[model samples]
Target: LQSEERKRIDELIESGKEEGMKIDLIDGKGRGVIATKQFSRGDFVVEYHGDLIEITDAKKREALYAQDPSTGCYMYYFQYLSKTYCVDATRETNRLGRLINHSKSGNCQTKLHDIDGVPHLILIASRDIAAGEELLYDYG
Candidate 1:
């Protein structure tokens, strides 16, 4: 986790509440805990977390990391796995960051960029959100 990542995480939390989105910390099937919130078009959700590795290498890392219980860190799909984790992580043995599930029609969209040889993660809303909708994103 980086300084910038911390700021964004806070912002996302604030935005979610300010926008009247229903946010709750609940268990997601096999994915640990997840931030359940309703989102609207262009809403900012939770940011992605990982390291900056080449696309091919990223895919490899995702497969190589055997669900490390020591850290919630695993190679995120290919996008987040190419960036940094949440600046202030919650715990060491939980998949707080890596457990977000994937969906074909996801509410979250990923934007990856490189700066100074490092990858960045930016999550954006993919569509209009409903009051009680659940935030979702695609993996493949």
Candidate 2:
């Protein structure tokens, strides 16, 4: 299963590179997906893969939710249910989605919306991004 996913993952990887994005695996960073080309604000980065978990109260949700520990904010891991299917993107972090990383001032944001009854995770840019600039989102 892992190998099969890797095959599919490779296709996505090649797609990014073909678009001129540099994909590198950072030691302790997991996999860092960076831009090889400049992108304006509101650029579409990539979709995050995970299940959406609902929390009625944002405050109470924060209590049960875990922070990055480094940044101390509600991480996406808490926003969604814990499952092996959840993808980790961070090189240092285990969560493949964590590869998105956190920024005090980030140019990206994540949102969930239904697409054909399936919730889709979208990573949208908040500002212009230069080549080699890391894509980040605030954990808080």
Candidate 3:
């Protein structure tokens, strides 16, 4: 089942068509990803898509974006294989993953999936989600 899951998951990540989700603006939250399809607990939602960079590169970007409000808030840093890395989504993108808002009690959670040794941050449903609910996770 894990293999099949990976196959389908890889297809979705590569194709860029995250069906059942749409981009919408929410009051007090500017922009967010809303689910249009029912998702069971542990269901794969979306990838927190962005450019993969090493820690040093991320450091430079972090400093550069210190005062730039333009997407500076989307830098996601994580540790993998004992080394730090980051996925910088600072540039304007057409993808929905970067637009997902944050919530301490969100129904979604982030997970790291390995693809040929490279890690991709994936959002999974932490609980059952109905249509019209916003996809959210506690941002790291």
Candidate 4:
């Protein structure tokens, strides 16, 4: 099952690259997603791929990270399905979704989808995005 999931995630990452998307270092921010090609409104930008874990495990992971000062306060857990589940994208296997930065006026939005009883985070363009634009979404 792990191997299958990894293969699926690798495919998604490859598709994102084919669509001209990449993870890059922002000037003010540490890391962010950038569009290398124009995208129409409501187009699929990328999917958040990560390890699906229970909320309890997510909390434990957060606590562990909080204790480490050199980590730079990065938490990649997203609440899903009434707070019962969380998608943790902190692992090394994660894709560009984890690097997407937050913006008050973001050009992208996240949509939760149920894929075989698991929650999948899909990033969609809320408005038309041009090439070289940084992809951002509200983290709230």
Candidate 5:
């Protein structure tokens, strides 16, 4: 049987699937998260899933892959607890949350929650979102 934490992660995955959001290739941007159904302002979209790592280790990993062309411009590290912990989503195990593109006027926003001392990065609709809309958020 899966652990309680794993079970919760699985439920989030299933819920996201049922919500009809998808990761797709954007025209100018590389990969982006897209919605297939309308969402209200406060709808829970998806959770950013990845291996939790120390900020130091995350920096090393980013440096190690810096030379690679496809390594991308930035690493998916969400800082929490005054930058003490970082959730690194650079691994293949990452979900669609890593594919969310940045926008100056984004329709979505990120909320950090503490789950068992770990930070759970949740993407939520900041405004009413239409079906077939590309999900964007401020990466600051």
Candidate 6:
């Protein structure tokens, strides 16, 4: 059933292949991600993978990173059940998921996938995506 896809997603997430994506320097957008292959509707695109952390830590980090500009854009805070968690992707290693540009209208939609109760922030094709297309998602 869906278990196959679940395992596939888990395997990819675990492996960190970050496949089917390429990092590109968008003319005015600084950096962004491009799809190297097609993604079917509902297919797992990429994980907004990072440190799954608590709010207080995230707040202190906000202050810590306040002196730095690039690092501030990397933290994503969201509500999970009754808790507020932050997924911080601030790292030097280039990860395409974090590079995806924001568009009010975009092809990717964010979804949370739980593995062993730890949730991963993933992007899925809101609709089918074509190869060579730039990956964009709503920041909300």
Per-candidate Cα lDDT values, in order, are 0.50, 0.52, 0.86, 0.71, 0.72, 0.86
Which lDDT tens digits does candidate 4 get at residues 1-140? 96776566456644654356876765764467789999888776787766678767878988887787554444455566557666666665436776777798998888775555577777878999999999998742
lDDT of 6 by residue, 1-140 (tens): 78887898999899988989888865765488889999998899999988899988888887888888866578888887777889988865656788888888999999888898888899999989999999999743
- 30-104, model 3: which lDDT tens digit per residue? 488899999999888999899899988888888898877765578888988997889998888788898888899
Q: What is the TM-score of each candidate against the true structure?
A: 0.47, 0.49, 0.89, 0.72, 0.73, 0.91
Best of the two (4, 5) by lDDT: 5
TM-score of 2: 0.49
lDDT of 5 by residue, 1-140 (tens): 53765566556754655355876765864477789999889776777666577878878877887877565544555558677666666665437777787798998888875656667777778999999999998742
Question: Comparing 4 and 6 by TM-score, which wins?
Answer: 6
For model 5, the run of ten residues with the poorest summed lDDT: 9-18
lDDT of 6: 0.86
State which candidate, 2 or 4, has the greater TM-score. 4
lDDT of 1 by residue, 52-113 (tens): 45656655555455465554444444434444333222233332333445678876676654
For model 5 the TM-score comes to: 0.73
Q: List candidate 2 segments past 4 Å from native.
A: 1-20, 23-31, 51-97
Error of 4 at 1 (Å): 28
lDDT of 4: 0.71
| Worst window of 10 by summed lDDT in candidate 6 | 23-32
- Highest TM-score: give the candidate number: 6
Q: How would you order the candidates by TM-score, starting with the best?
A: 6, 3, 5, 4, 2, 1
